[PDB]
Design a binder for this molecule. Structure first.
Ligand code: HEM
Length: 153
């Protein structure tokens, strides 16, 4: 359970992200695909992309980055009270997209890296730890839904 102060650190940096949702979403997906190429293979939509320059040039990738970060921002702003938001997301990611919880750990690393690069003054160690706790809570709750559905592993 995050404290109120932890949530305030999370949402303070997140309000900075929302000034350029699309640039953040590109940086995060590109970092994910470069650091963990197995993740790119889950996207029939993107797996034709073979270089970082091609990834940066893809408008459809930039669009999907906005989809992803908009969903995550709506979850963070619930400060843990996010059951309604996670149901469809866990369902689609477990049963349609076939995304292991481990790959959610990978994108969480990518999110934290990009926030640190773009917002260092609002992403000191206290805020890094709070955002790690928020993303852990996200993964914990998704993992429980995966387990219900027979996909935790
Ligand atoms: C912060 C974590 C993530 C969030 C908030 C998120 C959010 C979303 C949303 C909102 C959609 C569209 C609606 C839906 O299908 O449920 C989507 C689609 C999808 N996501 Fe995620 N996602 C996350 C992580 C991942 C990861 C780590 C992968 C793969 C390694 C992944 C793979 C996919 C795929 C394959 C689609 C379908 C894309 C398409 O063909 O249109 N997601 N995601």
């Amino acid at each position: 359970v995050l404290s109120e102060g932890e949530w305030q650190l999370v949402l303070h940096v997140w309000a900075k992200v929302e000034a350029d949702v699309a640039g953040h979403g590109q940086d995060i997906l590109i970092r994910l695909f470069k650091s963990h190429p197995e993740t790119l293979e889950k996207f029939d939509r993107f797996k034709h992309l073979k270089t970082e320059a091609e990834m940066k040039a893809s408008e459809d990738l930039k669009k999907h980055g906005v989809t992803v970060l908009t969903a995550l921002g709506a979850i963070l702003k619930k400060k843990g009270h996010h059951e309604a938001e996670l149901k469809p997301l866990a369902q689609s990611h477990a049963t349609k997209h076939k995304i292991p919880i481990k790959y959610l750990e990978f994108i969480s690393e990518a999110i934290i890296h990009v926030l640190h690069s773009r917002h260092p003054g609002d992403f000191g160690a206290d805020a890094q730890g709070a955002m790690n706790k928020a993303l852990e809570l996200f993964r914990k709750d998704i993992a429980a839904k995966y387990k219900e559905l027979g996909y935790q592993g």
